[PDB]
């Protein structure tokens, strides 16, 4: 089963780093298709094609992603602008909403059965945009639409391991909710081998929720979280590919589930041959987490409604 992974937004900061990681991490025989408007894109593919791995790479540019999307099983969307010094979530939605819409319109007609991973922010909102564009095209499969939240997981694993003296490579931290601010809810109470003092929970939780700011407000001037976001995306794509290939994997991801909390909600999901295999429950929460969960819902629902309205008016 020769998998095909397409990257829409392969010329941007996240996109190029993601192209590199996929070239190095994808299983042998996988096809990697890179697309973006900029004419540098075919050149990004040629650059990447020189790395000696058994992953076939092709690059495409111009206004039409259809050629790049041919036979795609996984479509990763990293197009648009990332959060940079002096930009609010409003700037992201302002620029990225129309970009995501146009790309999904092409996914809908070119590879409607692909699993789509939305990396472009704000994920809470941009995933709803994608769902509505797919619905309008009459091909919406909620098992195949994902908001990539994995970066919150990487950050959680890194900080928990640092603070509690655990193995950074083998520490597991579930993260539920959404992908921004108070919607990011790391389930610190479910981490093994970590004894928490009351005073550590809130500061660590706020640190994880506000981690993007540490990058933007770094000394001397700061920048965007380009590289960690690419690795988070690559890690997610890896899990999707495994699921599509028949291997059992579980990832916290933003999907349209039972709607008990919000239409879209990130929780553990077992991935399979059709994308979502089973949306697993969030498990037991501490009083702090239960409270944090209840607190985020109005913000999350608003993020969702903003994306739905962008397409439906």
Binding site for a second copy (CB under 8 A): 11, 16-17, 19-21, 23-24, 28, 38-54, 59, 61-62, 151, 154-155, 157-158, 161, 168-169, 171, 211, 214-231
Q: Determine, following the binding rule CB under 5 A, whether residue 9 of this chain makes contact with Cl ion.
A: no
Contact call for residues 304 and 125 (beta carbons, < 8 A): yes
Q: Which stretch binds Cl ion (CB under 5 A): 105-113, 131-139, 229-237, 250-258?
A: 229-237
Contact call for residues 20 and 45 (beta carbons, < 8 A): no
| For Cl ion, the closer CB: 24 or 46 | 24
Nearest residue to 237 via CA among 226, 225, 253: 253
- By a kind-dependent CB cut-off of 5 to 8 A, residue 123 interacts, out of a second copy, Cl ion, none, with Cl ion
Q: Is the bond preceding residue 122 a cis peptide, omega within 30 degrees?
A: yes
Query: Does 119 belong to an annotated binding site?
Result: yes
Helix (H, G, I), strand (E, B) or coil at 108: helix
Phi first, then psi: what are they for 264, rounded to 5°?
-110, 140
Contact call for residues 4 and 73 (beta carbons, < 8 A): yes
Q: Which stretch binds Cl ion (CB under 5 A): 38-46, 108-116, 128-136, 233-241?
A: 233-241
Q: Determine, following the binding rule CB under 5 A, whether residue 302 of this chain makes contact with Cl ion.
A: no
| For a second copy, the closer CB: 144 or 155 | 155
Shortest distance (Å) from residue 207 CB to a second copy: 11
- By a kind-dependent CB cut-off of 5 to 8 A, residue 226 interacts, out of Cl ion, a second copy, none, with a second copy
Residue of 106, 179, 238, 263 interacting with Cl ion (CB under 5 A): 179
Shortest distance (Å) from residue 259 CB to a second copy: 31
Length of the chain: 313
Residue 50 designated active-site:
no
Strands 74-77 and 115-118: parallel
| Residue that is written with structure tokens 């197009």 in the block | 79
- By a kind-dependent CB cut-off of 5 to 8 A, residue 211 interacts, out of Cl ion, a second copy, none, with a second copy
d(CA 66, CA 69): 5
d(CA 268, CA 280): 5
Q: Determine, following the binding rule CB under 5 A, whether residue 181 of this chain makes contact with Cl ion.
A: no
Query: Does 41 belong to an annotated binding site?
Result: no
Query: Does 12 belong to an annotated binding site?
Result: yes
Shortest distance (Å) from residue 161 CB to a second copy: 7
Helix axes 123-136, 89-110, angle to 10 degrees: 30
Catalytic residue, chosen from 4, 23, 179, 238, is 179
Helix axes 287-312, 198-209, angle to 10 degrees: 20
d(CA 280, CA 86): 38
Kindly determine how many residues on this chain lie close enough to bind Cl ion according to the rule CB under 5 A: 7
- Contacts with Cl ion, residue ranges (CB under 5 A): 24, 122-124, 179-180, 235
Binding-site residues, please?
9-15, 36, 83, 89, 96, 119-121, 155, 229
Binding-site residues for NAD(+), please?
9-15, 36, 96, 119-121, 229
């Amino acid at each position: 089963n020769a998998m095909k992974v397409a990257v829409l937004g392969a010329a941007g900061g996240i996109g190029q780093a993601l192209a590199l990681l996929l070239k190095l991490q994808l299983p042998a025989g996988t096809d990697l298709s890179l697309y973006d408007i900029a004419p540098v894109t075919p050149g990004v593919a040629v650059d990447v094609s020189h790395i000696p791995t058994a992953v076939n790479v092709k690059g495409f540019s111009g206004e039409d992603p259809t050629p790049a999307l041919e036979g795609a099983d996984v479509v990763l969307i990293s197009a648009g602008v990332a959060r940079k010094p002096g930009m609010d979530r409003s700037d992201l939605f302002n620029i990225n909403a129309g970009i995501v819409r146009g790309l999904i319109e092409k996914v809908a007609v070119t590879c409607p059965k692909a699993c789509v991973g939305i990396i472009t922010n704000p994920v809470n909102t941009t995933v709803a945009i994608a769902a509505e564009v797919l619905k309008k095209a009459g091909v919406y499969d909620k098992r195949k639409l994902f908001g990539v939240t994995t970066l919150d997981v990487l950050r959680s694993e890194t900080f928990v391991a640092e603070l509690k003296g655990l193995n950074v490579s083998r520490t597991s931290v579930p993260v539920i909710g959404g992908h921004s601010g108070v919607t990011i809810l790391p389930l610190l109470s479910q981490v093994q081998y970590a004894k928490w003092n009351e005073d550590e929970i809130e500061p660590l939780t706020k640190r994880i929720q506000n981690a993007g700011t540490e990058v933007l407000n770094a000394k001397a001037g700061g920048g965007s979280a380009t590289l960690s976001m690419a690795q988070a995306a690559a890690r997610f794509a890896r899990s999707l590919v495994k699921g599509l290939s028949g291997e059992t994997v579980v990832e916290c991801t933003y999907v349209e589930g039972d709607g008990k909390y919000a239409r879209f909600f990130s929780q553990p999901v077992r991935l399979g041959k059709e994308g979502v295999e089973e949306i697993l429950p969030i498990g037991p929460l501490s009083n702090f987490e239960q409270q944090a969960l209840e607190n985020m819902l109005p913000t999350l629902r608003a993020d969702i409604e903003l994306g739905e309205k962008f397409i439906n008016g």
